[PDB]
Amino acid sequence: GKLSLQDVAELIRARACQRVVVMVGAGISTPSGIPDFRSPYSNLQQYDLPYPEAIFELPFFFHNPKPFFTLAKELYPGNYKPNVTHYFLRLLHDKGLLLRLYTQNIDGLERVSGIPASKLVEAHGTFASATCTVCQRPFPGEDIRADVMADRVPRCPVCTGVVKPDIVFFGEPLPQRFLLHVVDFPMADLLLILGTSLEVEPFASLTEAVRSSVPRLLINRDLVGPLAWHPRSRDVAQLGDVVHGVESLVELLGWTEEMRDLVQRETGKL
Amino acid sequence: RTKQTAR
Ligand SMILES: [Zn+2]
């Protein structure tokens, strides 16, 4: 205390930190073109939302599911590519430093970036599976993909109700895979928080779940959530553009060449 | 423990 971005970089280079847990939000996906309703022509005006969080609210969805399924349509195919923040996390995995990446994003960029599903916790759900909003019948996500791409609201062939992809809405429980945090966060010897306002629970509360000895690096536009309210001696904030913060850390780590090579090959293949 | 906004 106080620790600096260079101190964290030197911990990773010394392999003093080998078990990095990462928490990311819509911050890391904006460089890729994907909107963030907390920001920014307005993302809300474009998606016709009284307020931002409405798009992931069941009451609003039942009144009008079109904004949600517009966003769903944009995200399904490879319309968007991973940016340097994704590839940084991929490189963390390639070097055997990533314990787990917890994401609030449903853009599937983490996977595309080449992070195995075993290393991912898609805490706010996935398009891979769907559920009837009335009769709770499960479906594979592929069934409703065609309907969503063709601008049709998918309906239950049993109950007649609206079938929704397994994106966690406000009021819904998180996927069971979220419970992996109970094992992961006590084991973490470094926590990275990238591109999140930590405005959504119980995801935000995970920042508190690491041992007090563990540095918490925030790379974000501004100091936020528990890290603002309940700081600790070994917290580091690199406030600014998330991609700038990441590239700064990459340079301090000495990975800039390796990153440049990785990003070129991987963006070549898309 | 379900999805809700913080504070
Ligand atoms: Zn049904």
Author numbering:
A (entry chain A): 121 to 160, 165 to 394
B (entry chain C): 0 to 6
What sentences appear in the manuscript?
Lysine crotonylation (Kcr) is a newly discovered histone PTM that is specifically enriched at active gene promoters and potential enhancers in mammalian cell genomes. We identified human Sirt1, Sirt2, and Sirt3 as decrotonylases in vitro and examined the molecular basis for how the enzymes recognize Kcr using X-ray crystallography. It should be noted that Sirt3 was found to localize predominantly to mitochondria and was mainly involved in metabolic regulations through controlling protein acetylation dynamics. We have demonstrated that endogenous Sirt3 functions as an ‘eraser’ to regulate histone crotonylation in cells.
The asymmetric unit consists of six molecules, each containing one Sirt3–H3K4Cr complex. The two globular domains of Sirt3 composed of an NAD binding Rossmann fold and a zinc binding motif are similar to other sirtuins. Residues 2RTKQTAR8 of the H3K4Cr peptide were clearly identified based on electron density. The crotonyl lysine is located in a binding pocket formed by hydrophobic residues Phe180, Ile230, His248, Ile291, and Phe294 of Sirt3. Residue His248, a catalytic residue for the deacetylation activity of Sirt3, interacts with the crotonyl amide oxygen via hydrogen bonding in the structure. Strikingly, the phenyl ring of residue Phe180 aligns parallel to the planar crotonyl group and has a short distance of 3.6 Å to its conjugated carbon–carbon double bond (C=C), indicating a robust π-π stacking interaction between the two functional groups. Interestingly, a primary sequence alignment of all sirtuins revealed that the phenylalanine residue (Phe180) of Sirt3 is conserved in Sirt1 and Sirt2, but not in other sirtuins, which may explain why Sirt4–Sirt7 were not identified in our CLASPI experiments. To further examine the importance of this conserved phenylalanine to the decrotonylase activity of the enzyme, we mutated Phe180 of Sirt3 to a leucine residue (F180L), which lacks an aromatic ring as a π donor but retains a similar hydrophobicity. The steady state kinetic data showed that the catalytic efficiency of Sirt3 F180L mutant (kcat/Km=21 s−1 M−1) for the hydrolysis of the H3K4Cr peptide was about 40-fold lower than that of wild-type Sirt3, indicating a critical role of the phenylalanine mediated π−π interaction in the decrotonylation activity of the enzyme. A mutation of the catalytic residue (H248Y) that is crucial for the deacetylation activity of the enzyme also completely abolished its decrotonylation activity. These data indicate that Sirt3 hydrolyzes crotonyl lysine with the same mechanism as it hydrolyzes acetyl lysine.
